[PDB]
Amino acid sequence: ITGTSTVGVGRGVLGDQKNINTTYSTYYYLQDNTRGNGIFTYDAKYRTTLPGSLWADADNQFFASYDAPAVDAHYYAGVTYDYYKNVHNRLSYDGNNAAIRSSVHYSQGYNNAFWNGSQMVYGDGDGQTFIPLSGGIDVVAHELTHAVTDYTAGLIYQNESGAINEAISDIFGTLVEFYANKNPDWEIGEDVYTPGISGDSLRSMSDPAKYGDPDHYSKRYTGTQDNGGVHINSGIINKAAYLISQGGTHYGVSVVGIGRDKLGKIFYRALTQYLTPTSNFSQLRAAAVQSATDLYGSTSQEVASVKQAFDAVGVK
């Protein structure tokens, strides 16, 4: 909407206060004009029609329980925009400052979040498996990263290409969590998963097997559930990425860590210059090796570490 840029204040899903960029025209709307062509947050009102209504508030104060998922979807979309722009020189998900749209309060008891081809969508959870999913910065960045993938490599959402698609979203979800630097870790979704159980998460990148996901290609799933295991076989690539950054010895193979920033540079270049819709795990290895070669040179430690990490997870 047309209006003047304002700054509201509210509380997120975990109870933390933050400022939000809003727009005033009769009401205060969740419309941040400070980033690209805007970040827009909508109320789906417990239904499944999308996007719903652009979020309107009478006083620019967002402390009601019903407001909290909107506050966090809006704020964390801003953090994710800032990461891509400041770290990778990428302007929104399409590289041309496309408007970023999110809807919260999707459906009833909805234990998931997704990119629907056009926008982000967040359930509230059922209060047992999840609380409102926009409370997790890694979750928000995971979802916006699906849009980046769809505009770039275009990885088809099934089998190995789909597990790469998922891992790319977990990798950048985690790198955004580290960028914001509030309780960062290599786990996925810990801030919004299972409020009655401490210390768990939906997935682990550092140890995928903790949640039943493979950490080696010989343990890949090849059945048909979950689009051929896209949220399962992602553990193999997540483990490789964790090893590239942090190092370790895995099934006897030692990897020298090169740190998060270089991980992100290597995988961003692979995603945007080398991967294609049909890339498999072996082709990802080749894309990551070439990306590291471009950035650091063929004789670099960075290239050697990429090779070690893929060796450690059984991907040649």
Ligand SMILES: CC[C@@H](C)CNC(=O)[C@H](CC(C)C)NP(=O)(O)CNC(=O)OCc1ccccc1
């Ligand atoms: C219990 C939740 C677990 C088991 C799986 N979900 C996830 O890992 C993350 C959320 C996590 C980070 C909290 N959501 P996603 O991968 O973006 C869901 N993908 C999606 O719906 O694909 C299908 C689709 C395709 C095309 C249009 C529309 C829809």
Ligand SMILES: [Ca+2]
């Ligand atoms: Ca208000």
Ligand SMILES: [Ca+2]
């Ligand atoms: Ca965390």
Ligand SMILES: [Ca+2]
């Ligand atoms: Ca996390």
Ligand SMILES: [Ca+2]
């Ligand atoms: Ca938990």
Ligand SMILES: [Zn+2]
């Ligand atoms: Zn995903």
